[PDB]
From a paper:
Human Pim1 kinase is a serine/threonine protein kinase that belongs to the calcium/calmodulin-regulated kinases (CAMK) group. In contrast to other protein kinases, Pim1 kinase is constitutively active, and its activity is primarily regulated through protein expression and stability rather than posttranslational modification, although regulation by phosphorylation has been reported. Pim1 has a typical serine/threonine kinase fold comprising two domains [N-terminal domain (NTD), residues 33–120; C-terminal domain (CTD), residues 129–305], which are linked by a hinge region with a unique LERPXPX motif and the gatekeeper residue (Leu120). The ATP binding pocket is between the NTD and CTD, and it is surrounded by the hinge region, glycine-rich loop (G-loop, residues 46–54), and activation loop (A-loop, residues 191–202).
Here, we report a crystal structure for Pim1 in complex with a newly developed inhibitor (SKI-O-068). Our inhibitor (SKI-O-068) exhibits a 133 nM half maximum inhibitory concentration (IC50) and a unique binding mode with the Pim1 kinase. For the inhibitor-bound structure, electron density was clearly observed at the ATP binding pocket and assigned as the SKI-O-068 inhibitor. In the SKI-O-068-bound structure, the trifluoromethyl phenyl moiety of SKI-O-068 was recognized by Leu44 (NTD), Val126 (Hinge region), Asp128 (CTD), and Leu174 (CTD). The SKI-O-068 cyclohexanamine moiety interacts hydrophobically with Gly45 (NTD), Leu174 (CTD), and Ile185 (CTD). The SKI-O-068 pyrido[4,3-d]pyrimidin-5(6H)-one moiety forms a direct hydrogen bond with the Glu121 carbonyl moiety (hinge region), and it forms hydrophobic interactions with Val52 (NTD, G-loop), Ala65 (NTD), Ile104 (NTD), Leu120 (NTD), Leu174 (CTD), and Ile185 (CTD). Superimposition of the SKI-O-068-bound structure and two AMPPNP-bound structures shows that the SKI-O-068 cyclohexanamine moiety is positioned similarly to the AMPPNP ribose moiety, and the SKI-O-068 pyrido[4,3-d]pyrimidin-5(6H)-one moiety is superimposed with the AMPPNP adenosine moiety. Moreover, SKI-O-068 directly interacts with Asp128, which is similar to certain ATP-mimetic inhibitor binding modes. Although a synthetic peptide was not added during protein purification and crystallization, additional election density was observed at the substrate-binding site for the inhibitor-bound structure, which is not a water molecule. Thus, we tentatively modeled five residues from pimtide (3KRRRH7) to the additional election density at the substrate-binding site.
Numbering used by the authors:
A (entry chain B): 3 to 7
B (entry chain A): 33 to 306
């Protein structure tokens, strides 16, 4: 996964 | 009167920062972004020359706004009963670095070098103006797709730059340094440098290196993508566990990996234009 914070 | 001088377009996004709309300045059709911040949701307040209480963000953006920059400009602001409204510059066409990375994956080193260099120039600019960003990350960077210029956004977690310790932080945990995680203490510059190392890993690998406290504390960096030794070295240097083992901005910019940077437009022509 490659995800927002 | 806020409503008459701007025309609101669609919601661009919302989150910890509040809500941001595309907009247009009615008088000259200048593309703008319109950001609404709720008063109850503002933790940190400042005050202007005149002395009235505004969001720290407004103070910070005013301190970095004069002249030109890789910092998004504050054009105007308004107070409302329960919120503040900020009018900000909006490049067109534009994409944030997070989405850009999502779409294109790991960036070529040449492109990452140009981008990273511009981030560094923008952060030096902030520091030079007495402003600490405290939330440097791909989500907080905009790409002007035509000129190939990066712009820093979202100063809402920022602070006045100081030389003493900070014991408060409300930026992004995965970009925050081990000294924050362990002791709840950091110095501005060396913490900024850590987050820059996270950012650079993100650019050249397509994702951040750490998701967990344990990994941050450990500070061991593994590469999933082919990445040059000079780039790996720069990254591991920025991510030194001891703050005083991290490079200064000068050392970063004099690093062998940082040699022969492309100009913004060259960057857009080679990597951004279709
Ligand atoms: N996932 C999104 C969430 C909203 C975020 N906010 C944003 N987006 C902005 N611009 C913008 C305009 C059109 C499209 C996009 C895009 F495609 F979301 F990156 C961003 C601006 C801006 O132009 N000026 C000042 C602030 C600003 N903030 C950009 C990334």
């Amino acid at each position: 996964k490659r995800r927002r914070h | 009167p806020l409503e008459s001088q701007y025309q609101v377009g669609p919601l661009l996004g919302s989150g910890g920062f509040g809500s941001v709309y595309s907009g247009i300045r009615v008088s000259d059709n200048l593309p703008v972004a319109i950001k609404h911040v709720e008063k109850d949701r503002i933790s940190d307040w400042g005050e202007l020359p005149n002395g009235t209480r505004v969001p720290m963000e407004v103070v910070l953006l005013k301190k970095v706004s004069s002249g030109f920059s890789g910092v998004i400009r504050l054009l105007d602001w308004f107070e409302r009963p329960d919120s503040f409204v900020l009018i900000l510059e909006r490049p067109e066409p534009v994409q944030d670095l997070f989405d850009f990375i999502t779409e294109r994956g790991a960036l070529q080193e040449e492109l990452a070098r140009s981008f990273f260099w511009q981030v560094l120039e923008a952060v030096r600019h902030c520091h030079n103006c007495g402003v600490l960003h405290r939330d440097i990350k791909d989500e907080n960077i905009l790409i002007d797709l035509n000129r190939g210029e990066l712009k820093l956004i979202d100063f809402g977690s920022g602070a006045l730059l100081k030389d003493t310790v900070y014991t408060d932080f409300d930026g992004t945990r995965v970009y925050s340094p081990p000294e924050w995680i362990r002791y709840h203490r950091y110095h501005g510059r060396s913490a900024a440098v850590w987050s820059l190392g996270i950012l650079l890993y993100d650019m050249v690998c397509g994702d951040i290196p750490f998701e967990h406290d344990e990994e941050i504390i450990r500070g061991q960096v593994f590469f999933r993508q082919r990445v040059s030794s000079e780039c790996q070295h720069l990254i591991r240097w920025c991510l030194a566990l001891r703050p005083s083992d991290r490079p200064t901005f000068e050392e970063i910019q004099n690093h062998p990996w940082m040699q022969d940077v492309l100009l913004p437009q060259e960057t857009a022509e080679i990597h951004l234009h279709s």
